[PDB]
């Protein structure tokens, strides 16, 4: 049953979207605002006032104090807008490259495994965004490995902190330790923790 | 006297084509030339394939010159914000061997 | 003076001036001769203007802008001083102004 | 306790959102080892060069920096229709 209107012009709308993505900073947040609204309208996740970070009664325990302070330093208060934004960021296009909100963790205390876990969960809940920021999280993980596993760390980093896939798909590790910057995300380089090459 | 003189008698005579003793401004007052990559000013080259004479090499005054200038997008000396992050433990801080 | 050309009523002066400007060895110009966009931001930064100004001041002003441009330190380098003045293993972040 | 609410509900929300009209990019292929975003520019012989994806640092929009601690409220400070008398449309 025909509708008297013009066909949705795919080839043109995609073009205008690219021109906008080039020239219009607002575009990202325009698109996010739809996705975010949708998350909110699906009523899928809501904050509660009841936190659940620790088993009873580990918070009371005096031996747990360093661990508990670690968790409390990581665990943010729930806010619907921020949660929805995360779920929406997962699907929204990225134009300005994302960066990690840098941790300063030194990984001396055992409790610091919390930060590693903070990433693992992020890699699970948000694999897309994770992949956007993973070099920046490799910089934290390296401080983790050089303390917890200094020998293996030396072998790894001796292989190279990054690699570049070439023709025919072979990896080519740099052989050179060097801190990642998000400048590299648009380059040929990859964080080497994620090479999954034994 | 009047070593400082650049122009004289900016009028025209009604008989002779230029007034006796009238002086035109020197060409160097008007050669903007170029800012050399080094940042020194230069007079325009007098011929093809010649670099221009640096303006400070010679004693003529030049009154049009290229001045580099920073724009609105630059800014210098503005105070800048940072996130300080203190160490989690004083006893975890190695001082040496560095 | 180069501006007087075809504006001064004084004939010989306009003739002498036109004569100097029509030489190959000299060429007046006034305005935005040069531009230098940032490599990342793609916005303009250091622009060269042909001002009416003595070559000495232009030389000095360019010496200054050159010292500031060619040093290759930024506001972020201030962090290196803050580390010296804060406890060992204190971290500093942002904003990478470049 | 929280997983069914993710897998059996939130995943569907992702699958739909993925087909929304404005989600035009390929954000990820599921392989961290090899995925690299496709990179386009508006560009002319006259010399204009506008990358679609640029690295510009934090922006006024606030979408650029990522606080990964957002993971915590989710695991331990959020209800869901599937997880939580327990019937809920």
């Amino acid at each position: 049953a025909l509708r008297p209107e013009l066909a949705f012009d795919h080839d043109h709308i995609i073009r205008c979207l690219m021109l906008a993505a080039a020239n219009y900073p607002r575009l990202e947040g325009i698109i996010v605002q739809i996705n975010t609204g949708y998350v909110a309208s699906a009523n899928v996740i809501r904050p509660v006032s009841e936190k659940r970070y620790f088993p009873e009664n580990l918070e009371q325990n005096q031996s747990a104090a360093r661990l508990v302070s670690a968790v409390k330093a990581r665990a943010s208060e729930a806010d619907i807008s921020s949660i929805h934004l995360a779920i929406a960021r997962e699907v929204s296009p990225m134009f300005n490259v994302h960066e990690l909100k840098k941790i300063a963790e030194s990984f001396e205390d055992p409790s610091s495994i919390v930060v590693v876990l903070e990433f693992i969960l992020f890699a699970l809940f948000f694999p897309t965004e994770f992949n956007r920021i993973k070099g920046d999280i490799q910089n934290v993980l390296l401080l983790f490995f050089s303390r917890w596993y200094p020998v293996e760390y030396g072998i790894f980093v001796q292989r190279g902190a990054t690699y570049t896939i070439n023709a025919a798909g072979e990896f080519e590790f740099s052989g050179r330790n060097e801190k990642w910057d998000q400048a590299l995300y648009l380059s040929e380089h990859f964080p080497a923790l994620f090479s999954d090459v034994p | 006297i009047s070593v400082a003189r650049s122009m004289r008698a900016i009028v025209n005579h009604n008989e002779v084509d230029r007034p006796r003793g009238a002086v035109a401004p020197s060409s160097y007052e008007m050669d903007t030339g170029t800012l050399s990559r080094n940042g020194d000013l230069l007079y325009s080259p007098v011929a093809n394939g010649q670099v221009g004479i640096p303006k400070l090499e010679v004693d003529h005054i030049s009154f049009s010159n290229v001045v580099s200038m920073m724009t609105a997008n630059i800014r210098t000396g503005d105070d800048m914000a940072v996130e300080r992050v203190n160490p989690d433990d004083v006893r975890a801080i190695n001082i040496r061997n560095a | 003076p180069a501006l007087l050309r075809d504006f001064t009523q004084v004939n010989w002066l306009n003739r002498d001036i036109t004569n100097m400007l029509q030489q190959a060895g000299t060429k007046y110009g006034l305005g935005l001769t040069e531009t230098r966009l940032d490599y990342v931001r793609l916005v303009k930064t250091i622009v060269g203007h042909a001002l009416n100004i003595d070559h000495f001041a232009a030389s000095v002003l360019n010496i200054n802008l050159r010292a500031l441009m060619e040093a290759n330190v930024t506001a972020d380098d201030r962090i290196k001083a803050l580390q010296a003045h804060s406890m060992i293993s204190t971290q500093f972040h942002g904003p990478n102004q470049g | 306790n929280i997983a069914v609410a993710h897998t059996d509900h939130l995943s569907v929300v992702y699958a739909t959102m993925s087909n929304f009209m404005l989600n035009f990019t390929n954000n990820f292929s599921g392989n961290h080892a090899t995925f690299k975003p496709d990179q386009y520019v508006i560009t002319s012989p006259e010399g204009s060069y506008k990358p679609i994806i640029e690295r510009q640092g934090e922006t006024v929009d606030g979408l650029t920096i990522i606080d990964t601690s957002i993971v915590w409220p989710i695991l331990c400070q959020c209800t869901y229709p599937l997880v939580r008398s327990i019937m809920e449309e």
């Binding site: 943010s76 208060e77 | 940072v82 996130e83 | - | -």
Partner: peptide, 15 residues
């Protein structure tokens, strides 16, 4: 403590 996607600035450095 609270989620904040921006850099959490606290100090200033004068030139």
């Amino acid at each position: 403590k609270v989620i904040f996607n921006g850099l959490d600035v606290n100090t200033e450095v004068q030139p």
